[PDB]
Amino acid sequence: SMTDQAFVTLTTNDAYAKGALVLGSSLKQHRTTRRLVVLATPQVSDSMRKVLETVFDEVIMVDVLDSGDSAHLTLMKRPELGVTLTKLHCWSLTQYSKCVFMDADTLVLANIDDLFDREELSAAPDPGWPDCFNSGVFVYQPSVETYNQLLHLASEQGSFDGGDQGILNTFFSSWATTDIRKHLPFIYNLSSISIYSYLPAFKVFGASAKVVHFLGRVKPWNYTYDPKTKSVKSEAHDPNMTHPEFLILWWNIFTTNVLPLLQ
Amino acid sequence: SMTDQAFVTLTTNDAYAKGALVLGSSLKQHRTTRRLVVLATPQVSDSMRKVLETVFDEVIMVDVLDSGDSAHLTLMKRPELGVTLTKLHCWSLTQYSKCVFMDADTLVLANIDDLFDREELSAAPDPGWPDCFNSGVFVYQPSVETYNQLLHLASEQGSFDGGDQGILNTFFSSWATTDIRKHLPFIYNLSSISIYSYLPAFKVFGASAKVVHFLGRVKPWNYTYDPKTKSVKSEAHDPNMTHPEFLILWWNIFTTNVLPLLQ
Numbered sequence: 001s002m003t004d005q006a007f008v009t010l011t012t013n014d015a016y017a018k019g020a021l022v023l024g025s026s027l028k029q030h031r032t033t034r035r036l037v038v039l040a041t042p043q044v045s046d047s048m049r050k051v052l053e054t055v056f057d058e059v060i061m062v063d064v065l066d067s068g069d070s071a072h073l074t075l076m077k078r079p080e081l082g083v084t085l086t087k088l089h090c091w092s093l094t095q096y097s098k099c100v101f102m103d104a105d106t107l108v109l110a111n112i113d114d115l116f117d118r119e120e121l122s123a124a125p126d127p128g129w130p131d132c133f134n135s136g137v138f139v140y141q142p143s144v145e146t147y148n149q150l151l152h153l154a155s156e157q158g159s160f161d162g163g164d165q166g167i168l169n170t171f172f173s174s175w176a177t178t179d180i181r182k183h184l185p186f187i188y189n190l191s192s193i194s195i196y197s198y199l200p201a202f203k204v205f206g207a208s209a210k211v212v213h214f215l216g217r218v219k220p221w222n223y224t225y226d227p228k229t230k231s232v233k234s235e236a237h238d239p240n241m242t243h244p245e246f247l248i249l250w251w252n253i254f255t256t257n258v259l260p261l262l263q
Numbered sequence: 264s265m266t267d268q269a270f271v272t273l274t275t276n277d278a279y280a281k282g283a284l285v286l287g288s289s290l291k292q293h294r295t296t297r298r299l300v301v302l303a304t305p306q307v308s309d310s311m312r313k314v315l316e317t318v319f320d321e322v323i324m325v326d327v328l329d330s331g332d333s334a335h336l337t338l339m340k341r342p343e344l345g346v347t348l349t350k351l352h353c354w355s356l357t358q359y360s361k362c363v364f365m366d367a368d369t370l371v372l373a374n375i376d377d378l379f380d381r382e383e384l385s386a387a388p389d390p391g392w393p394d395c396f397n398s399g400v401f402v403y404q405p406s407v408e409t410y411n412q413l414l415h416l417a418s419e420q421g422s423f424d425g426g427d428q429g430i431l432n433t434f435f436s437s438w439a440t441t442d443i444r445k446h447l448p449f450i451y452n453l454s455s456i457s458i459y460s461y462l463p464a465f466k467v468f469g470a471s472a473k474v475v476h477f478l479g480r481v482k483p484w485n486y487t488y489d490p491k492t493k494s495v496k497s498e499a500h501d502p503n504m505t506h507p508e509f510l511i512l513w514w515n516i517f518t519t520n521v522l523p524l525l526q
């Protein structure tokens with residue numbers, strides 16, 4: 001139990017808000033004892049903000065922070081991710097002593113309140129460059145000092161990837177080489193890249209997954225789902241469908257717990 | 264150092280021998296002070312063994328160890344990797360107190376003799392599942408005990424991937440959670456996936472690469488190289504041509520340093 005600790009997510013629009021709602025629903029499903037917070041920006045509709053208030057204990061309105069870094073963003077073919085600097089506001093939440101930030105395209109599969117035993121900055125490795133942590137799940141300590149240091153670093157130097165992950169890795173640069181306890185097990189941030197790349201590892205380690213991360217351009221809410229049979233249509237060359245269990249769980253939670261609040 | 268430590272590689276045939284020759288040449292180029300050893304099996308031709316003897320300090324003939332694990336191997340679409348259990352013979356080399364095993368599809372870009380400061384088992388994370396180490400570059404201590412333990416585990420339980428990496432990760436299972444000094448920086452084993460997946464990270468960290476690993480089915484020696492222009496032909500869908508400088512370096516060393524030894 002912890003009144004002064006929270007899970008925190010971010011949505012800048014109504015599309016990612018569907019993700020945030022499924023994430024928050026999943027944290028409730030697995031009996032979290034912590035608070036649930038969502039950072040939301042003005043593009044989130046008034047009606048959607050009210051729906052977010054049913055799942056989250058706090059809906060906190062913040063300003064969009066945008067890197068404007070088209071060079072690095074287009075490099076990744078993710079031109080829309082400049083607005084992920086808005087994550088930095090999570091450090092302003094000094095009403096909490098410790099928080100876990102989770103991307104709105106994540107989904108909880110088991111209680112993960114034991115993340116609160118960790119200290120800032122604890123994160124899992126990124127499969128794309130595993131000496132960087134993935135910033136979709138991380139344990140941090142709100143601080144007006146750290147907040148301002150990060151804003152300043154972002155303003156002066158920007159981010160090596162145009163989003164929050166580059167700047168967070170640069171700021172928390174000791175991660176790869178210092179304090180193995182700050183390496184969250186990969187099962188706390190299992191990104192589908194690893195769901196499909198080294199299938200033997202998934203086969204032996206994947207059932208222990210605590211959090212799945214639907215990293216990449218096509219998000220769960222972009223699929224066509226049939227609730228009668230519980231199937232999605234898959235583009236003839238779609239990776240996420242290696243182990244579609246996770247996407248179907250996303251859609252079952254959305255269909256049962258969230259969609260009826262929206263339409 | 265001089266006499267009692269070694270880099271060790273493996274080739275079961277004359278194709279991967281071209282890899283071992285380029286690797287060994289690269290280790291000499293960057294002025295290693297350690298011994299160079301290659302494990303070779305009977306499929307390696309007599310003429311190729313003689314060429315290997317011009318680059319390596321010793322060619323050690325060993326028996327092929329084959330998992331026969333079609334199920335796990337076909338699952339990775341690498342049905343030929345059952346013979347990678349032959350790597351386990353590296354622990355039999357008790358003429359050395361400490362060694363670095365390197366896959367025959369690796370290439371050294373800088374002196375990496377400081378690896379001998381590390382202790383068994385030190386290895387870099389695997390991008391496919393980064394709580395596993397990649398077994399293409401690892402620091403180990405030869406031991407008749409460890410050798411026999413590994414052979415026995417392979418005989419009785421096999422490997423989760425049908426190759427050496429699964430069994431090595433299973434045996435050395437503390438790697439992800441214990442002793443951060445046994446995490447080699449990813450620059451000591453910079454593999455394919457990561458050269459093309461998270462391009463911004465390569466752009467800021469890739470210049471520091473010490474070892475490139477041509478992981479995957481298409482090996483450098485399977486490309487068609489034109490020495491006049493210094494280009495390769497690529498199949499229109501080849502991700503590893505995003506940053507082709509490593510492949511061309513491989514071919515430059517092959518063409519300039521290895522080819523004269525094959526006369």
Ligand SMILES: *[C@H]1O[C@H](CO)[C@@H](O[C@H]2O[C@H](CO)[C@@H](O[C@H]3O[C@H](CO)[C@@H](O[C@H]4O[C@H](CO)[C@@H](O)[C@H](O)[C@H]4O)[C@H](O)[C@H]3O)[C@H](O)[C@H]2O)[C@H](O)[C@H]1O
Pocket residue numbers: 076078081084103126127128129134135136161162163164165166193215216217218239459460461462
């Ligand atoms: C298999 O599927 C995937 C998705 O189509 C493909 O993977 C490629 O595309 C991903 C980008 O969509 C790459 O992931 C890298 O880049 C991401 C950002 O674009 C990283 O995401 C992280 O960083 C952002 C921005 O700073 C943060 O806001 C996020 O919270 C955080 O997750 C990701 O870590 C990084 O690895 C991937 O490398 C590409 O390979 C692949 O092509 C398909 O075959």
Ligand SMILES: *[C@H]1O[C@H](CO)[C@@H](O[C@H]2O[C@H](CO)[C@@H](O[C@H]3O[C@H](CO)[C@@H](O[C@H]4O[C@H](CO)[C@@H](O)[C@H](O)[C@H]4O)[C@H](O)[C@H]3O)[C@H](O)[C@H]2O)[C@H](O)[C@H]1O
Pocket residue numbers: 196197198339341344347366389390391392397398399424425426427428429455456477478479480502
């Ligand atoms: C981009 O190209 C890459 C090629 O690198 C594609 O990657 C896929 O295919 C790889 C295998 O060819 C996958 O790598 C995984 O499996 C390898 C074995 O097949 C692993 O290699 C390691 O294990 C072997 C066997 O035990 C050892 O002998 C080796 O020394 C060791 O390197 C590798 O670690 C593991 O990640 C990759 O994950 C696949 O995604 C990719 O599809 C293209 O898009």
Ligand SMILES: O=c1ccn([C@@H]2O[C@H](COP(=O)(O)OP(=O)(O)O)[C@@H](O)[C@H]2O)c(=O)[nH]1
Pocket residue numbers: 009010011012013016080081083084102103104105106136214215216217
């Ligand atoms: O237009 C956007 C893009 C991103 N996000 C937030 O930023 C996070 C990181 O982006 P995303 O998960 O798309 O990046 P990926 O993990 O695919 O690299 C999302 O999960 C959301 O919380 C957002 O609110 N609006």
Ligand SMILES: O=c1ccn([C@@H]2O[C@H](COP(=O)(O)OP(=O)(O)O)[C@@H](O)[C@H]2O)c(=O)[nH]1
Pocket residue numbers: 272273274275276279343344346347365366367368369399477478479480
């Ligand atoms: O037919 C083979 C296949 C593999 N190897 C050896 O085993 C290593 C691992 O195989 P590979 O590098 O092809 O696996 P990858 O790194 O691509 O997954 C090689 O580098 C070689 O040293 C070999 O000698 N003969």
Ligand SMILES: [Mn+2]
Pocket residue numbers: 103104105106136213214215216
């Ligand atoms: Mn994400």
Ligand SMILES: [Mn+2]
Pocket residue numbers: 366367368369399476477478479
């Ligand atoms: Mn290899």
